[PDB]
Amino acid sequence: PEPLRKAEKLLQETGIKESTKTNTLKKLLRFSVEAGGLTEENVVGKLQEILCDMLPSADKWQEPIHSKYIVLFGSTGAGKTTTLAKLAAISMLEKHKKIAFITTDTYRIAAVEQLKTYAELLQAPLEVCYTKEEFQQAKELFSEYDHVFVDTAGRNFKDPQYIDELKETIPFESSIQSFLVLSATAKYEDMKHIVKRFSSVPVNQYIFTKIDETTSLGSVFNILAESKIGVGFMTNGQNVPEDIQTVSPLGFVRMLCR
């Protein structure tokens, strides 16, 4: 095989899983044998289209912030708080909205200070909530606001009591967009499990963090391929509020291929 040896090479460098890698060459080979001739130049194009077709449709990516309540939950240290700040900063400064915070992360030390200092900078109010009732109450106070950004404590969501804890603290009944936050630095086999545990909770979008920190995006692709939802944001550094961005399925696949 000629350029297909090259396509085989690309797929190698992305961290995609073997099954997938293979099945992509199948589709690739199939198409090209039975339909015209592909150059060493034009392979990549076709390759990317094929991969992209395995990801959720674009209308399921880059969902904008509309709902009143914006919740991020996810793994420990993944960057939830930092990302919440960025998101909020955008809502106030760029989009000129009345914003407020709730935090639920009573567990980790200084997590409240952390969000507090952001809320102070942004001159927005902040409620700590230990219970759904307190949360429901907080809702009353913030009824005049446009957006309430809600932070939560990172847990080992492999163990499902924390899924329970979470569900028993957040009212998903509400006008609410919920983002599952995972680190681009995480192992696929790990994320796979997390996403299973989150099955019983209404996640709207993924957020992938620290894409500036990992060598390959294959792991993230692998997750997205087995998912019915797309990615709302990706983060690429520690700086607030600059280091956030959005992507389309194609835009994502381009990143995948270096």
């Binding site: 900078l121 700086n239 607030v240 509020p241």
Partner: peptide, 16 residues
């Protein structure tokens, strides 16, 4: 020097 440096600068400017 602070991961929030930029944001801080933006808020200072708003104030102005």
């Amino acid at each position: 020097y602070d991961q929030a440096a930029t944001l801080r600068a933006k808020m200072e400017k708003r104030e102005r």
